[PDB]
Design a binder for this molecule. Structure first.
Ligand SMILES: Nc1ncnc2c1ncn2[C@@H]1O[C@H](COP(=O)(O)OP(=O)(O)O)[C@@H](O)[C@H]1O
Ligand SMILES: *C(=O)CCNC(=O)[C@@H](*)CC(=O)O
Ligand SMILES: [Mg+2]
Ligand SMILES: [Mg+2]
Ligand code: NA
Lengths: 18, 264
């Protein structure tokens, strides 16, 4: 249910600055 | 037999895991020194990764190889799961790399030999590790490398896998793109390690996850000039976008750079 850490971080980057 | 916490003396934390610490331990009757890996049940359940722990236990329990860390048993109480592990006294390769900055060619080739021996055994059981980064590589009393932490591993007897797994810097294109993958993912990670061991940084390192992802998918990396021609040859062959172009582990063990520099 939790993705690998890097998936979560890369999604943050997308939400933060596109 | 039926282990319980009362069967062990506990000592200092050896390192910090995602779901709990790993502690120095001693089985009371034998006085034998071990490691107890603790996982908090509520953490596990919240993260929904119970299947990773089941795979870790089911797979690592049955592996027996000098370069694979042994998992002797397990138990649980009201709040925690405990894995009883072989103690690795010399710590992680991660810490060694931090201490030395980079490894010379003899040390690197020896680790790669031991890693390839261990992965050969895994792949003969059709097990794929998928997370062989330096903080999961431990060192025994004679400085010998031991692959640990099988929580991302899988037993892939026939079918190809599609799980998003592992740690970005060590993953091949087919795994970060969520395409089908097979045991060749570990060969790519072996190339990342060989580079990181010689250089001190993994080859696709970037300050954003997005750029690291793009560098991996397009095999965008370069060699510093002190990396010798033989090491470049091995690493370039391992870091091929096409999984089937990556060498077999037998070919790694036979590579002239490996045999000229490994003490193993
Ligand atoms: N058997 C062991 N002997 C010595 N140190 C260990 C052992 N197992 C784990 N460690 C230390 O604990 C850290 C986390 O262990 P690990 O099994 O990788 O947890 P996680 O699955 O949460 O990453 C390792 O990086 C290492 O520093
Ligand atoms: C999210 O899906 C990110 C996709 N990849 C990139 O943005 C990498 C682009 C690049 O650095 O060339
Ligand atoms: Mg780990
Ligand atoms: Mg793990
Ligand atoms: Na680093």
């Amino acid at each position: 249910s939790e993705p690998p850490s890097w998936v979560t971080e890369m999604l943050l980057e997308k939400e933060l600055w596109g | 037999r039926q282990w319980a916490l009362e069967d062990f003396e506990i000592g200092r934390p050896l390192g910090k895991g995602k779901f709990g610490n790993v502690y120095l331990a001693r089985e009371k009757q034998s006085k034998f020194i071990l490691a107890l890996k603790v996982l908090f049940k509520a953490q596990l359940e919240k993260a929904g990764v119970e299947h990773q722990l089941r795979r870790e236990v089911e797979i690592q329990s049955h592996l027996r190889h000098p370069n694979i860390l042994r998992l002797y048993g397990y138990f649980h109480d009201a709040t925690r799961v405990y894995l009883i592990l072989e103690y690795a006294p010399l710590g992680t390769v991660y810490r060694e790399l931090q201490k030395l900055s980079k490894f010379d060619e003899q040390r690197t080739a020896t680790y790669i030999t031991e890693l390839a021996n261990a992965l050969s055994y895994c792949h003969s059981k059709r097990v794929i590790h998928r997370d062989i980064k330096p903080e999961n590589l431990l060192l025994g009393s004679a400085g010998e490398l031991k692959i640990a932490d099988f929580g991302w591993s899988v037993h892939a007897p026939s079918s190809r896998r599609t799980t998003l797994a592992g740690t970005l810097d060590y993953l091949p294109p087919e795994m970060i793109e969520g395409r089908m993958h097979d045991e060749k993912v570990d060969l790519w990670s072996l190339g990342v390690l060989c580079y990181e061991f010689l250089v001190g940084k993994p080859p696709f390192e970037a300050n954003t996850y997005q750029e690291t992802y793009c560098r991996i998918s397009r095999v965008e990396f370069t060699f510093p000039d002190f990396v010798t021609e033989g090491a470049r040859d091995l690493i370039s062959r391992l870091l091929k976008h096409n999984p089937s172009q990556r060498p077999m582990l037998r070919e790694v063990l036979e590579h002239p750079w490996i045999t000229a520099n490994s003490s193993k």
